[PDB]
């Protein structure tokens, strides 16, 4: 089809969408479904019992929030279908699913059934002409004008270190851990509870997420700032009241470098990156250490780069150059890479026909992917 293709990066926290070839996704909205929990009494209340997109943010306190994706794995598929039709709704990207091919972006090392059901949903419920599923990290490396390097993509659900060499991501050297920005927000909720601020409500979890985004940082030395009493910085809640955050500012994101602070049997993010680099043959290791690209929202923490540099230097072999690159467009880098990939005419040969899916099934979509 000669019509423009649409890139959809369905992250756990935020879902980016846009017609390919644009330098930026203009239709990014949070990835949750809000349903009203109070009883409607008037004639003329808000019509509809499903609230997705900026409307869910406008009427946030009126709604109970439910996240369809957890750790990059779609738990509720009906809500995912609702969100993906909302992507085509008149509010954002007013178009038809039949007119545009879709470049879906998916987390690496996901279960087989997830890709199978995503293809089934996009081919049956949506009469899409052409679907192609890709990864999030290889695109993020495409965005920054490189073909060799390691991408540390840290999103809302999952964080993974992916070494790519000459475009093709090494499937054997992929490292993945499930602690991400959502787990940091939960840890911040627990710590805020330990300061005398209860946010048990589902809509107040978004306020906790906002507090995480706006007032948090990673200390250079963990024990140094842990022992030192930090100044109490005050944050303004939506109602207008104020909360003193205090040590929870720096204790919360420390989960990323110490998963045992919530009893998760997994490696830290610095350990994940260094293990991803060291899982490859040594001739490429010295190049991978130099070409480190941060990606995803959770890498935007104040002081993330310095602490990651310190930890990687502590772990990596001595006398090896290490350079962390932090692009300003970290949130939208994966979508930018998807747009770049879709702009290439070779993408015309990379998608799967409706006839191809009907004939072969999941075999076609999985042999087409890497």
Ligand X SMILES: Nc1ncnc2c1ncn2[C@@H]1O[C@H](COP(=O)(O)OP(=O)(O)O)[C@@H](O)[C@H]1O
Binding site for ligand X (CB under 6 A): 11-14, 155-157, 181-182, 185, 209, 212-213, 296-298, 300-301, 331
Shortest separation between residue 127's beta carbon and a second copy, angstroms: 25
Per rule CB under 8 A, is residue 241 in the interface with a second copy? yes
What are the residue ranges of helices labelled H in 150-215?
181-193, 202-214
| 35, 51 contact by CB (below 8 A) | yes
Judge whether 151 and 140 are in contact, CB under 8 Å.
yes
Q: If contact means CB under 5 to 8 A according to the sort of partner, which of Mg ion, ligand X, a second copy, none does residue 13 touch? A: ligand X
Q: Contact with Mg ion (CB under 5 A): which of 7, 10, 11, 293?
A: 11
| Shortest Å, Cβ 16 to Mg ion | 8
- For residue 217, the SS3 value is strand
Compute CA distances 280 → 178, 231, 284, 286, whole Å.
22, 44, 7, 10
Q: Mark 36-53 as b/e (b = at least 16 C-beta within 10 Å).
A: beeeeeeeeeeeeebbbb
Per-residue x/- track, 124-163, Mg ion (CB under 5 A): ------------x------------------x--------
Q: Which is nearer to a second copy, 231 or 240 (CB)?
A: 240
**Which letter, b or e, does each residue of 167-192 get, where b requires 16 or more Cβ atoms within 10 Å of its Cβ?**
eebbeebbbbbbbbbbbbbbbbbbbb
Closest separation in Å from C-beta 88 to a second copy: 26
Comparing CB distances to ligand X, the nearer of 93 and 256 is: 256
Shortest distance, CB of residue 184 to a second copy, whole angstroms? 15
Is residue 234 at the binding interface for a second copy, with CB under 8 A as the rule?
no
Question: Which window, 124-132, 214-222, 249-257, 340-348, contacts a second copy (CB under 8 A)?
Answer: 340-348
From residue 105 to residue 144, the character string flagging contacts with a second copy as x (rule: CB under 8 A) and all else as - is ----xxxxxx--------------------x--x--xx--
Q: Among residues 87 and 139, whose Cβ is nearest to a second copy? A: 139
Shortest Cβ 77–a second copy spacing (Å): 13
Cα radius of gyration (the chain): 21
d(CA 130, CA 1): 9
What is d(CA 364, CA 55) in angstroms, rounded to the nearest whole number? 38
Phi, psi of 79 (to 5 degrees): -65, -35
């Amino acid at each position: 089809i000669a019509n423009q293709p649409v890139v959809i990066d369905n992250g756990s926290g935020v879902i980016k969408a846009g017609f390919a070839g644009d330098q930026i996704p203009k239709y990014c909205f949070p990835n949750y479904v809000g349903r009203p929990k109070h009883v409607r009494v008037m004639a003329g209340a808000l019509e509809g019992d499903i609230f997705i997109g900026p409307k869910a943010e406008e009427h946030r306190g009126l709604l109970s929030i439910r996240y369809p994706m957890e750790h990059g794995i779609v738990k509720d598929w009906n809500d995912m279908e609702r969100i993906w039709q909302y992507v085509y709704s008149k509010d954002q990207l007013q178009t038809f699913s039949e007119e545009h091919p879709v470049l879906l972006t998916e987390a690496p090392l996901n279960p087989r059934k997830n890709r199978e059901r995503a293809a089934e949903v996009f081919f049956e419920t949506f009469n899409v002409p052409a679907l192609f599923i890709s990864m999030q990290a290889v695109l993020s490396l495409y965005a920054t004008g490189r073909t060799t390097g390691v991408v540390l993509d840290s999103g809302d659900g999952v964080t993974h270190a992916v070494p790519i060499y000459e475009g093709f991501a090494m499937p054997h050297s992929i490292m993945r851990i499930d602690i991400a920005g959502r787990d940091v927000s939960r840890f911040l909720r627990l710590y805020l509870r330990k300061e005398g601020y209860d946010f048990h409500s589902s809509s107040e979890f978004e306020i906790v997420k906002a507090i995480k985004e706006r007032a948090c940082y990673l200390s250079i030395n963990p024990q140094k700032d842990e022992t030192l009493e930090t100044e109490k910085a005050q944050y303004y809640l939506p109602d207008g009241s104020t909360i003193e955050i205090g040590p929870s500012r720096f204790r919360a994101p420390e989960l990323l470098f110490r998963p045992d602070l919530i009893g998760e049997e997994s490696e830290g993010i610095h350990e994940v990156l260094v293990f991803a680099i060291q899982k490859s043959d040594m001739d490429l290791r010295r190049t991978l250490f130099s070409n480190i690209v941060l990606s995803g929202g959770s890498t935007l923490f104040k002081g993330f780069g310095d602490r990651l540099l310190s930890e990687v230097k502590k772990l990596a072999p001595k006398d090896v150059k290490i350079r962390i690159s932090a692009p300003q467009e970290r949130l939208y880098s994966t979508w930018i890479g998807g747009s770049i990939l879709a702009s290439l005419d070779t993408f015309k040969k990379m998608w799967v026909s409706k006839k191809e899916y009907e004939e072969d099934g999941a075999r076609s979509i999985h042999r087409k992917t890497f």
